[PDB]
């Protein structure tokens, strides 16, 4: 505990209409088809994304996401002022600091350009560390303690929200550990 | 508001005659007679009980709309458009006065508005058929999507009520496929070099 | 904006390189090289002058749109979508960085985004190609309309400005035909028995 | 003929407020051509928004009237009268029951009465000028070859309870306009 454990709750007002936030707002799954929801300004209307309710303005914070054996997922943080309407590339320059899994076994960092990651173990549970001031975001296997990736000395000028993205319709949800 | 709409047609299982067997995605259907043998099928008012028919879940009350159907190696089929209000129960004649606008394959021949008096003299087996609606024009038209050639426009009709995509199968174990609307890379990661030969 | 728009593409003669010869209905185009030999051709800022290109007169700032192109007569060609603001006078690479999203046939090969490093391994000659635009998605995609199979989606791009249907002929004498949107019996007397095998 | 002389020559002027947007009414409001494509006009309640139709400005409410239409060698045209109250928005079958009494030419040489069902007319000579005779009280509209005086077609089922406008329809894009002869 070098870093304050954040208590992260999914903001249903931000969830793409194809996403289903649980009753307890800790887990998200994909619908077969979009729900009939309004296109309020907070809602990601293109990317299959959902934010936390609370954003980070300073200090050091940590949370954990259960990915299970889900074939596809990306998680990390984004700026308050990212583009929520239409596609934007999820990259540092557009205000997104994320990594994840695609196609069952391809781990990437959503950098400009993307980079492949060599992971000895595939993670079932991921830890995300943010240091607003130094400007550092790090991903770890939550079980092994094994490193995954770090963005270094970033110059954050806005509040940062936790962000979760799933494209695939599978039975394993994405679950925030309380 | 003059745009041709390329419809994404999904079958409405509640309309489907019990012998009709829909795929789980509801974009393909075959006819398997007495497949409910030994079962009591609830006979909800939306379901066709005699004609082996199924409708698209879409309704249209205005504008221009079309979709494509794969009918290759199906020896008995009907496609077209019908009023939402058509008779579901009994042996209704599938003709414009009863709210049906159809192209049919029957005994190796193509028949407009399911009429034995309107055999269409096609010089090839239809494989992919275009179904076209222009509501305000009273127009239901059929196309051969091999060369995008016109086949038939039904007599102009006052639709009056919303109309829906219409399907019939008159043979067994022979599926038709409703061609999904193109979606590009919708729901899919596109690599920075592009996405190639997606399936 | 839910709806997929099947576009009725009509070529804009003001965009057309001077060697391009449009059909009267403006739904087909062939290249007739140096066909203005001995002529002074007037200045027109809309006209492509470095490469034999022509735009659809339609432009799109949102939504989903597609059209089909018959390419079976032609083996030096480029089709897709470009920004309305693309360079018209100077020669540019027909790549996303310059505001072009293209499928090309060049020297017997299909090249994605006109690139020698993006040869598409197709097993058949393309006859009818579907050009698909999803503005919000940054998506230009190409389909083989024989079996409606996916060929290629260009790297996702922020279009930013209105985009237009884009056509080009290379060292080629044969025409491209743009498949008109289906119109049923629009403009035509439908007999009381129906209209059978209408030919335009 | 004494009977001809019962009919008042009507002064028929095309009403641009009624013309389907793909129609061009001339300066003098006597002639109509097709544009390649619809013009950007309002869909005001008076305008035919589907059928390629235009009305005269004056409707008939009683008495006997005559007007003449130059068709020349146009290969497609239909003319007659329609009720004030016809459907102007969307396709409706142009037939007596929907309030249209019209005949004309399609495909260069197929003359029809636009009734239910349509009937093929015999025209030993194709007309270049068509005389139109309306007798409001006998619900009669008769069509004649205005040059050689020969009869083309008669409806004896016209509304005598509705105002009746001259109506003119062209589907095709061709050199020859449809022209009303001014009353003279
Ligand atoms: C919702 C969706 C289909 C996102 C994919 O985004 P992308 O094509 O830009 O790919 P990625 O961010 O996975 O590299
Ligand atoms: C504008 C147009 C295409 C009219 C034809 O109407 P229709 O098909 O009802 O035929 P007609 O009235 O000539 O019998």
Residue numbers in the entry:
A (entry chain D): 305 to 482
B (entry chain B): 322 to 520
C (entry chain A): 322 to 521
D (entry chain C): 301 to 484
Quote the authors verbatim.
Vγ9Vδ2 T cells—a major subtype of human circulating γδ T cells—respond to multiple cancers and infectious diseases in an MHC-independent manner; they are specifically activated by small, non-peptidic diphosphate metabolites called pAgs. The sensing of pAgs in target cells requires a surface protein, BTN3A112–17, that has both intracellular and extracellular domains. Here we show how—in both humans and alpaca—multiple pAgs function as ‘molecular glues’ to promote heteromeric association between the intracellular domains of BTN3A1 and the structurally similar butyrophilin BTN2A1. The BTN3A1–pAg complex functions as a composite interface that directly binds to BTN2A1, bridged by the pAg molecule at the centre of the interface.
We next tested the ability of DMAPP and IPP, which are accumulated in tumorigenesis, to initiate the BTN3A1–BTN2A1 association. ITC analysis indicated that BTN3A1 B30.2 alone has a weaker binding affinity for DMAPP (120 μM) and IPP (658 μM) than for HMBPP (1.64 μM). However, both DMAPP and IPP promote the association between BTN3A1 and BTN2A1 B30.2, albeit to differing extents (KD = 12.3 μM and 155 μM, respectively). However, in contrast to HMBPP, DMAPP does not form hydrogen bonds with the His351 and Tyr352 residues of BTN3A1 due to the absence of a 1-OH group. Mutations in BTN2A1 B30.2 that disrupted Vγ9Vδ2 T cell activation by HMBPP also impaired activation by zoledronate. Collectively, these findings demonstrate that DMAPP and IPP act as molecular glues to drive γδ T cell activation.
